[PDB]
Amino acid sequence: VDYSGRSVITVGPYLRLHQCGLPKKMALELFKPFIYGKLELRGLATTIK
Amino acid sequence: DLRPLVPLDGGRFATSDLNDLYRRVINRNNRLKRLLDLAAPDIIVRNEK
Amino acid sequence: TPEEKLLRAIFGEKASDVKDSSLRVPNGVSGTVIDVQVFTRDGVEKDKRA
Amino acid sequence: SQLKLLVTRGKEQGYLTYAEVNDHLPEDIVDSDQIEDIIQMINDMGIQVMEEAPDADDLMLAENTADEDAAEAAAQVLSSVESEIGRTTDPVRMYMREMGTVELLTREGEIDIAKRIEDGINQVQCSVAEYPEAITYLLEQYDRVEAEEARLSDLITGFVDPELAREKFAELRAQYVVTRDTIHATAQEEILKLSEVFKQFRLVPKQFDYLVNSMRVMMDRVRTQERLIMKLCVEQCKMPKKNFITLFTGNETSDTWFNAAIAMNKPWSEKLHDVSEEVHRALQKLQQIEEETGLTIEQVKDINRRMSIGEAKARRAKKEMVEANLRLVISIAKKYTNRGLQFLDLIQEGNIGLMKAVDKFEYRRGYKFSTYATWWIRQAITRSIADQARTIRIPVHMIETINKLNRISRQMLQEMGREPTPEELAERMLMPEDKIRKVLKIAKEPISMETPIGDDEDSHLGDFIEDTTLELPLDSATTESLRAATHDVLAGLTAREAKVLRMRFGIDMNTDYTLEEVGKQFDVTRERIRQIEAKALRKLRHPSRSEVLRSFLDD
Amino acid sequence: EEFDAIKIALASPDMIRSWSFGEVKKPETINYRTFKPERDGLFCARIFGPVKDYECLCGKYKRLKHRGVICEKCGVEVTQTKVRR
Numbered sequence: 001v002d003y004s005g006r007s008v009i010t011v012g013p014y015l016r017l018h019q020c021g022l023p024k025k026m027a028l029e030l031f032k033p034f035i036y037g038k039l040e041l042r043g044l045a046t047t048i049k
Numbered sequence: 050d051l052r053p054l055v056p057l058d059g060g061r062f063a064t065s066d067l068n069d070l071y072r073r074v075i076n077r078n079n080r081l082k083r084l085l086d087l088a089a090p091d092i093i094v095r096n097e098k
Numbered sequence: 099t100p101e102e103k104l105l106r107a108i109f110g111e112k113a114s115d116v117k118d119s120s121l122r123v124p125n126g127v128s129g130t131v132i133d134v135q136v137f138t139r140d141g142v143e144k145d146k147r148a
Numbered sequence: 149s150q151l152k153l154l155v156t157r158g159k160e161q162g163y164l165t166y167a168e169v170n171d172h173l174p175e176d177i178v179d180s181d182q183i184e185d186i187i188q189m190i191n192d193m194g195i196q197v198m199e200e201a202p203d204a205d206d207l208m209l210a211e212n213t214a215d216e217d218a219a220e221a222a223a224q225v226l227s228s229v230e231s232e233i234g235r236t237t238d239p240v241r242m243y244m245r246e247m248g249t250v251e252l253l254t255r256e257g258e259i260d261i262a263k264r265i266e267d268g269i270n271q272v273q274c275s276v277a278e279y280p281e282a283i284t285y286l287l288e289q290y291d292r293v294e295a296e297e298a299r300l301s302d303l304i305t306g307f308v309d310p311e312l313a314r315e316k317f318a319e320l321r322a323q324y325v326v327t328r329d330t331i332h333a334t335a336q337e338e339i340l341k342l343s344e345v346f347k348q349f350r351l352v353p354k355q356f357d358y359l360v361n362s363m364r365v366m367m368d369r370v371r372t373q374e375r376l377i378m379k380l381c382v383e384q385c386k387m388p389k390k391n392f393i394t395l396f397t398g399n400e401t402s403d404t405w406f407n408a409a410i411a412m413n414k415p416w417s418e419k420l421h422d423v424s425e426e427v428h429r430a431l432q433k434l435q436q437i438e439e440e441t442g443l444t445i446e447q448v449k450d451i452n453r454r455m456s457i458g459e460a461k462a463r464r465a466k467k468e469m470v471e472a473n474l475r476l477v478i479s480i481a482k483k484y485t486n487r488g489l490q491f492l493d494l495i496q497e498g499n500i501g502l503m504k505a506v507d508k509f510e511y512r513r514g515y516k517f518s519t520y521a522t523w524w525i526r527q528a529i530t531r532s533i534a535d536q537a538r539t540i541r542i543p544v545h546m547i548e549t550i551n552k553l554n555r556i557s558r559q560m561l562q563e564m565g566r567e568p569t570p571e572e573l574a575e576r577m578l579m580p581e582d583k584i585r586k587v588l589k590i591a592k593e594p595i596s597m598e599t600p601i602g603d604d605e606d607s608h609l610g611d612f613i614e615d616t617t618l619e620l621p622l623d624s625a626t627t628e629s630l631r632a633a634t635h636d637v638l639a640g641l642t643a644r645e646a647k648v649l650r651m652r653f654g655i656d657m658n659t660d661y662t663l664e665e666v667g668k669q670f671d672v673t674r675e676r677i678r679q680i681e682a683k684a685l686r687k688l689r690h691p692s693r694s695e696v697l698r699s700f701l702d703d
Numbered sequence: 704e705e706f707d708a709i710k711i712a713l714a715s716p717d718m719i720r721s722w723s724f725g726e727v728k729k730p731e732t733i734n735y736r737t738f739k740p741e742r743d744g745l746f747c748a749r750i751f752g753p754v755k756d757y758e759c760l761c762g763k764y765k766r767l768k769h770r771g772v773i774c775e776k777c778g779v780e781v782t783q784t785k786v787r788r
């Protein structure tokens with residue numbers, strides 16, 4: 001399944017129970033298409049490349 | 050393409066097995082046709098079938 | 099292709115027959131290359147670094 | 149019945165063992181192939197083991213499948229296999245047992261078998277010399293060949309220099325024409341001279357097949373005409389066998405024994421009236437065949453009958469000899485049992501080779517047929533093991549080179565001690581030092597893509613070979629974006645501009661055009677096209693107009 | 704392609720010919736020197752379609768406009784390469 005990942009889970013007590021923590025790097029690797037869409041929307045890159 | 054013959058690195062090819070089985074069956078069909086053209090004795094054609 | 103070809107025409111950029119397939123570091127690691135070793139089948143003129 | 153007691157114990161106890169089944173089984177079979185079949189049947193039966201160890205706990209615990217309508221058939225197969233007889237399994241053993249009913253010697257009985265073979269070939273040879281279209285075919289081939297539409301050495305495969313053959317062609321031409329130019333005073337003498345001048349020649353087997361096929365077509369014509377006669381008289385008019393053969397025998401040429409037979413005041417004569425024209429046509433084709441050949445249809449039948457009987461005798465001698473020599477074939481084919489091919493495939497190649505050996509044997513050089521056919525068998529099996537063994541097929545000379553390399557590799561790998569290098573093989577062998585690289589690259593098998601790469605959960609090498617030709621979704625999105633960009637750019641031109649710049653390229657159309665068609669469109673196959681194209685190229689080179697395009701530049 | 708129930712039944716012979724794209728005849732697969740496919744073995748070009756997308760086997764026709772035309776020299780219907788599947 002594309003758009004997946006994994007890692008070592010951990011503790012993280014500073015959370016309300018409706019939000020799992022998550023790394024910056026797994027996020028920026030799972031949401032590349034979303035990022036690309038938003039970045040061609042805000043004109044921070046005229047083309048997708 | 051459901052039974053490929055992928056070119057692996059080094060000239061070595063890594064084929065599926067259905068290529069092998071169909072090669073066997075096509076061999077035996079052609080050989081049976083060849084036996085029939087000659088009209089071999091019945092032990093030959095029987096063992097071929 | 100099409101309009102890619104129009105691009106080639108507008109800019110004269112010649113797409114070489116050469117294909118980049120270099121060994122680029124696996125993403126995530128940041129080290130110090132400590133040692134390079136080169137091997138050569140004995141029919142190739144050894145390069146400079148070898 | 150006791151094996152049925154094994155069945156009921158497997159039902160109750162919930163399993164069995166190798167010791168249990170091996171206890172209850174019917175004695176005296178013990179081939180271990182019937183055993184594996186019966187064990188697979190007991191597995192397919194209610195019992196689902198077959199065991200070794202009795203149990204078994206929470207690890208896959210309390211398993212079962214009903215599988216109704218399979219138990220009643222499986223137990224039936226058991227009770228039937230035990231009670232009747234022990235059935236053979238596989239097909240190599242089928243072939244062994246089925247040929248073991250061959251009396252396995254011809255110690256100089258080969259001479260009688262070759263006698264029968266010569267009988268067949270000589271009776272059919274008398275048929276050859278007697279078949280008129282045979283000599284006409286030879287004369288026609290001679291003319292076609294002399295002009296240069298065919299070769300002399302392609303038609304006939306030597307007598308017992310093509311100019312010798314050609315003067316003999318003219319000799320037999322005169323013989324056949326003098327046979328034909330006496331139409332009944334000396335016809336027998338004529339055929340005698342023709343036969344005795346033609347019965348030391350020979351042809352290609354395929355030319356003889358063409359002769360025999362025109363002969364078979366002649367027979368098919370005569371048989372269809374005898375159908376048109378008898379199936380339209382007897383089976384259409386209640387003209388029984390006796391009352392039809394009373395006039396169908398002996399002369400069998402004139403129309404009288406049908407037409408006048410219509411007038412003999414009989415029921416069949418009172419039923420043949422509408423089949424009169426059809427049987428008239430039948431006897432007319434028969435007499436036209438007469439016109440064709442010169443010999444009565446009864447002589448036609450007698451000649452083809454003698455030919456057929458000689459052919460049957462020869463085929464039967466062939467069969468008898470090959471049945472004998474199957475043992476020889478098996479013995480000689482045992483010696484290649486892992487070349488990359490099956491035992492039965494080897495022995496079938498040997499069957500073909502032994503047949504060719506039979507077809508090309510003569511005692512007139514004093515050979516011993518066993519050792520004679522040994523060569524043909526080994527050669528045919530070698531040709532097969534070369535041609536149709538490797539997965540990707542390599543040619544014969546290439547296989548010879550490969551086995552040369554293997555022989556020399558073994559010799560060097562105990563001469564030099566460690567092993568040889570390609571630079572050393574290119575001087576023990578005398579190859580160009582690069583063909584050896586290509587040879588030892590090519591001559592290896594492929595890996596089985598279901599190979600178990602068991603270094604995982606449970607995987608296969610096939611599950612790890614990625615796809616290379618698929619276009620990245622990044623690439624496809626970029627392509628669509630570039631289409632949109634260049635479309636808006638080209639819209640940012642004039643109608644004539646955009647049209648010429650679409651046409652001279654392959655943009656938004658089929659394959660792209662030439663200046664000939666550009667001119668056939670805009671009236672000017674000339675510098676107007678060049679002007680517009682190059683000037684629009686300059687116009688779109690404008691930064692502030694193609695900046696986005698050049699941002700599409702992957703540099 | 705919201706088709707229906709799926710359906711299964713025996714494989715009638717003339718049906719098996721309607722599924723066909725030309726009889727396989729020979730046991731070859733590839734050509735041991737140029738790794739194009741020999742015609743016609745388990746593999747092929749004219750039977751099971753082209754190797755490279757929109758490109759003939761011998762190479763006479765190599766443009767998108769020529770899709771559909773079967774090359775007169777090796778009868779390979781120039782079409783996509785997923786038709787090889």
Ligand SMILES: [Zn+2]
Nearest residue numbers: 761774776777
């Ligand atoms: Zn072609």
